[PDB]
A = this chain, B = another copy of it.
Amino acid sequence: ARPCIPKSFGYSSVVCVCNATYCDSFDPPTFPALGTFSRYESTRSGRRMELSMGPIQANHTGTGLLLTLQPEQKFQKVKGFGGAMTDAAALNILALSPPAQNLLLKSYFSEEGIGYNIIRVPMASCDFSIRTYTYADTPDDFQLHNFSLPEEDTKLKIPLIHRALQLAQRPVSLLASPWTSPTWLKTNGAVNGKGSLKGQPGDIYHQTWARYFVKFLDAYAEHKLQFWAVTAENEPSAGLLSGYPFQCLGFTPEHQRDFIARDLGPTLANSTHHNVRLLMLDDQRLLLPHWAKVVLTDPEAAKYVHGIAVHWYLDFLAPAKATLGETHRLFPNTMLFASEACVGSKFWEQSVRLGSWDRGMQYSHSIITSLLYHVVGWTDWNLALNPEGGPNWVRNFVDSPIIVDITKDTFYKQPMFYHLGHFSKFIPEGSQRVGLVASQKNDLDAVALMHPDGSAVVVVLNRSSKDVPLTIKDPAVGFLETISPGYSIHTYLWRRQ
What 1/0 mask marks residues of chain A from 1 to 40 whose CB sits below 8 Å from any chain B CB? 1000000000000000000000000011011110110000
- Given the known A-B contacts A33-B138, A138-B33, are A27 and B204 also in contact in the complex, defined by CB atoms under 8 Å? yes
Is A408 in the interface zone, CB < 8 Å from B? no
What 1/0 mask marks residues of chain A from 190 to 223 whose CB sits below 8 Å from any chain B CB? 0000000001001111000000000000000000
Residues in B neighbouring A143, C-beta threshold 8 A: 32, 36, 53-55
CB distance from A185 to the nearest CB of B (A): 11
CB distance from A202 to the nearest CB of B (A): 7
CB pair A142–B32 under 8 Å, yes or no, is yes
Q: How far is the CA of A204 from the CA of B204 in the complex (A)?
A: 63
Of B35, B55, B204, which contacts A30 at CB under 8 A?
Answer: B204
Within residues 287 to 323 of chain A, which ones have a CB less than 8 A from any CB in chain B? Answer: none
- Given the known A-B contacts A32-B140, A140-B33, are A55 and B204 also in contact in the complex, defined by CB atoms under 8 Å? no
Of B54, B145, B203, which contacts A55 at CB under 8 A?
Answer: B145
Interface residues on chain A, number (Cβ under 8 Å): 24
Q: How far is the CA of A33 from the CA of B139 in the complex (A)?
A: 6
CB distance from A190 to the nearest CB of B (A): 19
Is A141 in the interface zone, CB < 8 Å from B? yes
Q: How far is the CA of A145 from the CA of B37 in the complex (A)?
A: 12
Q: How far is the CA of A140 from the CA of B204 in the complex (A)?
A: 63
Residue on B nearest A184 in the bound complex, by CB: B33
Residues in B neighbouring A199, C-beta threshold 8 A: 27-28
What 1/0 mask marks residues of chain A from 161 to 188 whose CB sits below 8 Å from any chain B CB? 0000000000000000000000000000
CB distance from A415 to the nearest CB of B (A): 25
CB pair A1–B33 under 8 Å, yes or no, is no
CB distance from A37 to the nearest CB of B (A): 10
CB pair A36–B203 under 8 Å, yes or no, is no
Q: How far is the CA of A54 from the CA of B139 in the complex (A)?
A: 16
Q: How far is the CA of A222 from the CA of B143 in the complex (A)?
A: 51
Of B1, B32, B138, B202, which contacts A1 at CB under 8 A?
Answer: B202
CB distance from A137 to the nearest CB of B (A): 11
Q: How far is the CA of A36 from the CA of B28 in the complex (A)?
A: 57
CB distance from A130 to the nearest CB of B (A): 27
CB pair A142–B203 under 8 Å, yes or no, is no
Of B32, B55, B142, B205, which contacts A33 at CB under 8 A?
Answer: B142
Q: How far is the CA of A366 from the CA of B135 in the complex (A)?
A: 46
- Given the known A-B contacts A27-B199, A199-B27, are A141 and B204 also in contact in the complex, defined by CB atoms under 8 Å? no
CB pair A30–B145 under 8 Å, yes or no, is no
Residue on B nearest A31 in the bound complex, by CB: B140
Residue on B nearest A145 in the bound complex, by CB: B55
CB distance from A224 to the nearest CB of B (A): 28
Residues in B neighbouring A145, C-beta threshold 8 A: 33, 35-36, 55
CB pair B202–A142 under 8 Å, yes or no, is no
Residues in B neighbouring A33, C-beta threshold 8 A: 138-142, 145
CB distance from A292 to the nearest CB of B (A): 29
Q: How far is the CA of A36 from the CA of B55 in the complex (A)?
A: 69
Residues in B neighbouring A138, C-beta threshold 8 A: 33
What 1/0 mask marks residues of chain A from 128 to 150 whose CB sits below 8 Å from any chain B CB? 00000000001111110100000
Enumerate 10 A-B pairs (CB-CB under 8 Å) in ascending A order.
Answer: A31-B140, A32-B142, A32-B143, A33-B138, A33-B145, A36-B142, A36-B143, A53-B142, A53-B143, A55-B143
Contacts A1-B202, A27-B204, A30-B142 supplied; 11 other A-B pairs, CB < 8 Å: A27-B203, A28-B199, A31-B140, A32-B140, A32-B141, A33-B138, A33-B139, A33-B141, A35-B145, A54-B143, A55-B145
What is the interface of chain A, defined by CB distance below 8 A to chain B?
Answer: 1, 27-28, 30-33, 35-36, 53-55, 138-143, 145, 199, 202-205
8 smallest CB-CB distances across A and B, nearest first, come from: A33-B140, A33-B141, A32-B142, A30-B204, A32-B140, A27-B203, A53-B143, A36-B143
